[PDB]
Design a binder for this molecule. Structure first.
Ligand SMILES: *[C@@H]1O[C@H](CO)[C@@H](O[C@@H]2O[C@H](CO)[C@@H](O)[C@H](O)[C@H]2NC(C)=O)[C@H](O)[C@H]1NC(C)=O
Ligand SMILES: *[C@@H]1O[C@H](CO)[C@@H](O)[C@H](O)[C@H]1NC(C)=O
Ligand SMILES: *[C@@H]1O[C@H](CO)[C@@H](O)[C@H](O)[C@H]1NC(C)=O
Ligand SMILES: *[C@@H]1O[C@H](CO)[C@@H](O)[C@H](O)[C@H]1NC(C)=O
Ligand SMILES: *[C@@H]1O[C@H](CO)[C@@H](O)[C@H](O)[C@H]1NC(C)=O
Ligand SMILES: *[C@@H]1O[C@H](CO)[C@@H](O)[C@H](O)[C@H]1NC(C)=O
Ligand SMILES: *[C@@H]1O[C@H](CO)[C@@H](O)[C@H](O)[C@H]1NC(C)=O
Ligand SMILES: *[C@@H]1O[C@H](CO)[C@@H](O)[C@H](O)[C@H]1NC(C)=O
Length: 750
DNA sequence: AGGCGTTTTT
DNA sequence: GCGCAC
């Protein structure tokens, strides 16, 4: 029988998802559907312009309703089409259980009547230009009001949004208010004392005083950034902050003892008034980005009081048209004993020395340090030795060049104890000297440099704890036999996109160093265009995973018997990616020379038009096989052979016209199968023997199915619907006539 | 007339 | 197949 909520899709935790179905009105759903197991209803980005009383009446246990992007104002319409949305006055009253509503990106000019149950209301990017107490009548349970972007460059109005004095006082539970991008010039008078988060960024509130935040002693977060902007850093349309502005009175934040988060970004500040931070001893996050505090951070004592502060953002506090030769942080940074995260990216300074970060050197909790995009050309990396609790340094996108004068295939550094990112720098060789005091390092990123060195075993000698080394997007010449052997703990090495040496026609290269890395588990030689004149075998007893994608095994395996055993010496290998290797053909003899230990084999985006399925028995441990993106015209020439351990099979984006009967039958372990984007005109239960019920995923979307009245496929997909993703909307007909390009349920086939 | 379309959400 | 060395 049918999916219960056609054309929408029943998802977990009682969600009915009608997203992106181009609906003109809300679907009703027959009484046969369990409309009370329905706890949430999503109608994102349809084209419903008219909302009725009956539309939600029958969904009597509905808690969440998303109606976003259905009727976008002209400025947000991708083609500037106007749209007004009519709501019948009992539309939402008929859902007395409603808790969260999203009416954002919809042309409405007044708030509709809403049930008292409502805990959350989002009215952002609407055309509502006024809020007064009649707007939000009887919403005493309401805790969240979000109404950003009702008057700005993308949704203009010609005036300020008008929140009348005391308009929201009726809302006794209101903790979260947001009114960003509304062209406000003053804070709204008399907001509920219950407010905990108040967000007024990207308005034009140029003056503040303690009157402007009267009675808001519950505030835990206050965002007032972007009201007086520096447009030299603006990516969007921007009005430059007037001269003699902004004016923030000293004691503006004095009565906010509970304040945890203060955002003052992009406020054109040349000087921090320390009186701003008096009485803010409970402050944990302070954002001062995109201001002009480049001098003030070498001098100020305004941080002295902030004992509990954890995150400090000083990024893009850069002087117009200049980078500094030197930057020395203030002594008062040394009293931030709680500090975990410091962002100094985009200040622009040329030198990083002991003096630069001296005050931070004895802070016990300092873990993450962002110094990227600073045009730094000299860096004494040895300063980080004495930092007690450091876990992460981002020094990427700098001009440092030396010492001073898919998680299956490559693991991330996220859970390691000490990571240095030096990517997007100007190293052309690696000097041991620059790492002299970094023997604690577990992860080093040096990608997107200009390293064009024949590494030999002498470059990374100090790094005796290093487990991950990323050298992707460089020009390494792999030639000497002992490259990387100075790293006793190396488990993951990325040498991808170092293609240029391998392009050098008539000059060969040496991969025999892989045998000399006894602890290595992960290796990417991906996107190197390896095609000729290389070692005939990779040899390693430790290696579990090898990305060899983006090379030309094609040309290698065409070259007599030289490279037929290339991957055979990888005795423990469990994952191999041979994708985009230009393979037009495979011998069964080539596949059997891959390691017996293999569990995962990718051959994506090759040019294979034929695959001898019987040779899968030569890889007895194979659980996953990816042939996506090849040119198979059929699943045939044998079946999946007996006793095969295969669980995941992807033959998507081929040109498969048919499947032989009983093709999958002997693959009893098969759980996930992707037949998407092929030329299948039908889906038969006879492909699966009659053991298809074990399948957890069967993707048959984007296939030119023959939707002839009474077709055998229709019935089959309903018997295994739990396993077919997107069945209600995305499995479509290629024929006949007017059904082409429309869902299989666009007319009843039975 | 309405169309357009996967466009952070906080 | 990239200063080794009948
Ligand atoms: C089955 O394969 C298809 C097509 O190869 C997958 O659809 C692609 O999904 C990726 C991300 O997973 C997207 O970047 C592409 O845009 C999609 N391509 C097409 C042509 O639709 C699909 O996700 C796979 N199904 C499952 C269940 O994993
Ligand atoms: C907050 O709403 C709840 C209903 O969920 C109610 O108990 C309480 O009266 C409300 N508080 C105020 C101050 O209105
Ligand atoms: C913002 O406010 C003023 C009202 O004085 C108006 O002139 C201006 O056009 C408004 N801006 C936008 C983007 O609507
Ligand atoms: C602040 O609170 C006092 C005491 O309850 C009240 O009388 C006063 O009107 C309030 N001020 C504002 C601006 O809401
Ligand atoms: C590596 O090459 C350097 C030149 O940079 C040379 O001095 C050194 O002896 C070689 N080291 C090893 C371990 O082969
Ligand atoms: C490749 O490197 C190994 C390890 O030093 C070396 O023995 C072998 O001779 C090299 N191959 C060539 C062709 O130079
Ligand atoms: C697959 O290879 C085997 C072993 O060499 C061979 O017997 C068989 O004919 C091949 N299958 C097809 C369909 O050509
Ligand atoms: C393989 O099957 C295809 C598709 O039906 C067929 O055209 C071809 O002749 C078959 N070849 C072998 C060797 O089985």
């Amino acid at each position: 029988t049918l999916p219960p909520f056609l054309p929408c899709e029943l998802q977990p935790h009682g969600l009915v998802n009608c997203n992106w179905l181009f609906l003109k009105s809300v679907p009703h759903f027959s009484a046969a559907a369990p409309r009370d197991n329905v706890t949430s209803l999503s109608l994102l980005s349809n084209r419903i312009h008219h909302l009725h009383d009956s539309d939600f009446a029958q969904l009597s246990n509905l808690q969440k309703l998303n109606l976003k992007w259905n009727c976008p104002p002209a400025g947000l319409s991708p083609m500037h089409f106007p749209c007004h949305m009519t709501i019948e006055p009992n539309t939402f009253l008929a859902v007395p259980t409603l808790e969260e509503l999203n009416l954002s990106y919809n042309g409405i000019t007044t708030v509709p009547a809403l049930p008292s149950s409502l805990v959350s209301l989002i009215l952002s990017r609407t055309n509502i230009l006024q809020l007064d107490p009649t707007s939000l009548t009887g919403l005493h349970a309401l805790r969240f009001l979000y109404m950003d972007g009702n008057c700005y460059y993308k949704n203009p109005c010609g005036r300020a949004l008008e929140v009348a004095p005391g308009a929201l006082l009726g809302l006794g539970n209101l903790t979260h208010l947001s009114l960003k991008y509304n062209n406000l010039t003053t804070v709204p008078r008399s907001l509920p004392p219950s407010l905990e988060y108040l967000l007024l960024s990207y308005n034009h509130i140029v003056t503040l005083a303690p009157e402007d935040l009267a009675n808001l002693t519950a505030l835990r977060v206050l965002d007032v950034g972007g009201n007086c902007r520096r447009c030299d850093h603006a990516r969007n349309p921007c009005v430059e902050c007037p001269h003699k502005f902004p004016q923030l009175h000293s004691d503006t934040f004095s009565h906010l003892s509970r304040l945890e988060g203060l955002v003052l970004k992009d406020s054109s500040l040349y000087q921090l008034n320390p009186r701003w931070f008096r009485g803010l001893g409970n402050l944990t996050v302070l954002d001062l980005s995109e201001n002009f505090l480049y001098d003030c951070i070498t001098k100020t004592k305004a941080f002295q009081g902030l004992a509990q502060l954890r995150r400090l953002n000083l990024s893009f506090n850069y002087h117009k048209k200049v980078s500094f030769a030197h930057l020395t942080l203030a002594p008062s940074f040394g009293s931030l004993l709680s500090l975990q995260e410091l962002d100094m990216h985009g200040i622009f300074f040329r030198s990083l020395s002991q003096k630069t970060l001296q005050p931070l050197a004895r802070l016990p909790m300092l873990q993450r340090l962002y110094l990227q995009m600073n045009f730094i050309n000299q860096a004494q990396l040895g300063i980080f030795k004495d930092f007690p609790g450091l876990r992460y340094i981002d020094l990427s996108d700098n001009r440092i060049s030396g010492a001073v004068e898919s998680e299956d295939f490559m693991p991330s550094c996220k859970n390691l104890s000490f990571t240095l990112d030096l990517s997007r720098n100007n190293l052309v060789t690696v000097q041991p000297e620059m790492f002299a005091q970094l023997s604690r390092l577990q992860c080093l990123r040096l990608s997107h440099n200009s390293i064009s060195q024949a590494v030999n075993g002498s470059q990374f000698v100090p790094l005796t704890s290093l487990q991950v080394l990323d050298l992707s997007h460089n020009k390494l010449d792999l030639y000497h036999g002992r490259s990387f052997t100075e790293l006793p703990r190396l488990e993951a090495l990325d040498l991808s996109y170092n293609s240029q040496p391998f392009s050098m026609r008539g000059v060969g290269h040496n991969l025999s160093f892989v045998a000399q890395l006894p602890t290595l588990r992960y290796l990417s030689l991906a996107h190197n265009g390896i095609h000729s004149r290389v070692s005939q075998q990779l040899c390693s007893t430790s290696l579990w995973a090898l990305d060899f994608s983006g090379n030309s095994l094609s040309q290698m395996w065409a070259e007599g018997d030289l490279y037929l055993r290339f991957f055979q010496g990888l005795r423990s290998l469990i994952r191999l990616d041979l994708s985009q290797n230009r393979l037009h053909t495979l011998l069964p003899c080539t596949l059997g020379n891959l390691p017996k230990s293999l569990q995962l084999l990718r051959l994506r985006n090759n040019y294979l038009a034929f695959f001898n399925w019987s040779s899968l028995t030569l890889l007895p441990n194979l659980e996953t096989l990816d042939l996506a993106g090849n040119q198979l015209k059929a699943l045939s020439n044998g079946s999946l052979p007996s006793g095969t351990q295969l669980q995941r099979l992807d033959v998507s984006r081929n040109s498969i016209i048919f499947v032989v009967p009983g093709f999958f039958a002997l693959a009893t372990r098969l759980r996930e199968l992707n037949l998407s984007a092929n030329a299948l005109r039908t889906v038969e239960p006879s492909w699966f023997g009659f053991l298809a019920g074990s399948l957890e995923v069967l993707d048959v979307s984007a296939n030119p199915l023959h939707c002839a009245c009474g077709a055998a496929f229709v019935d089959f997909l309903l018997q295994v619907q739990a396993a077919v993703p997107g069945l209600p909307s995305r499995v479509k007909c290629g024929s006949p006539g007017q059904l082409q390009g429309r869902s299989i349920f666009a007319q009843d086939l039975r």
